[PDB]
Every structure is written in C-alpha cells, then in structure tokens.
Design a protein around this ligand. Structure first.
Ligand SMILES: COC(=O)[C@@H]1O[C@H](CO)[C@H](O)[C@H](O)[C@@H]1S[C@@H]1O[C@H](CO)[C@H](O)[C@H](O)[C@H]1O
Ligand SMILES: [Cl-]
Ligand SMILES: [Cl-]
Length: 138
C-alpha cells in the first residue's frame, strides 16, 4: 500500500472535471481520517471524518487561511466504518468540491479558495491503511 501521511502532488492545482480517488481500509478502532487539499500552507478543503466526537460520528469540513480555521461545515451522514474498505471520490466542479463515498453522494463544499490552480497538494492522513490515491480528468 502507501505510507500515511501521504502526499499526492496535484500538478498545476485542481480544475473543474478533475476527479481524485482515494482507496483504503479504515483501521479497527479508528478515531479520524483527514484529506487536506493544500494551497501552500493554506488548506483549501479539509475533509475530516471524526469517529468519536463526544460519542458521535461526524464529518467536519473547513478551510484554513493564514493559519486560522474558518467556520466548519458539518454532516451527520457518516458512510465510514472501522475495519472496512472505502473509496472516496472528490470531483472538482465549478462552484464546489463534490464528494462521494462508496459510489454514493455524500456532500458538497463550496469553494472558498478561488485560486484553484494553486491547490497543488493533497495530504491524506489518519487511521487508515491507504491502498491508492490518484486523479483523472473526466
Ligand atoms: C483547534 O481548535 C479548533 O479549531 C476547534 O476546536 C473545537 C473545540 O473547541 C472543535 O474541536 C473544532 O472541531 C475545532 S478542532 C480542529 O478543527 C479543524 C477543522 O475546523 C481541524 O479538524 C483540526 O485538525 C482540528 O484540530
Ligand atoms: Cl451535524
Ligand atoms: Cl484564493
């Protein structure tokens, strides 16, 4: 597999029609997973499944600018399960990142960072065994 945390370079940043696919398996007794689509030190799109926040499972998404986190967007639909294989697809669309897990739509996150072509790295971290991470233009 791959070593987590893993860095996937996104040459020339992201663009509408670019699809990022992450395959892996959640560790037993997981606490968190995180995708960090980075513009330099800023995080344009942070996707953070939390497996135990006050005994609830929640996906937290946010942007970090100049080292400050913004206002979080939260989703109680939670398709992940400890110990199980998953696929995350992030499709960049004109106004938002669209995320599907295991072929089912999960959430959309509107672009806050506007310089999409400078979002040049995806960091993948957390309690997972990472099998593959790649992109294709669709
Ligand atoms: C570091 O604290 C925070 O920014 C917030 O802290 C509160 C608790 O007071 C709560 O945990 C919020 O979820 C965040 S935690 C923070 O959240 C960002 C995304 O908003 C990232 O996941 C980061 O890794 C977390 O530490
Ligand atoms: Cl919620
Ligand atoms: Cl910007």
């Amino acid at each position: 597999p791959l070593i987590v945390p893993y860095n996937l370079p996104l040459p020339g940043g992201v663009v509408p029609r670019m699809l990022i696919t992450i395959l892996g398996t959640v560790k037993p007794n997981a606490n968190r997973i995180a995708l960090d689509f980075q513009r330099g030190n800023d995080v344009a799109f942070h996707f953070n499944p939390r497996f135990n926040e006050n005994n609830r499972r929640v996906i937290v998404c946010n942007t970090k600018l100049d080292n400050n986190w913004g206002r979080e967007e939260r989703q109680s639909v939670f398709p992940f399960e400890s110990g199980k294989p998953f696929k995350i697809q992030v499709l960049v669309e004109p106004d938002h990142f669209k995320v599907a897990v295991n072929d089912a739509h999960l959430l959309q996150y509107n672009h806050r960072v506007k310089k999409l072509n400078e979002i040049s790295k995806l960091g993948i971290s957390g309690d997972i065994d990472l099998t593959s991470a790649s992109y294709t233009m669709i």
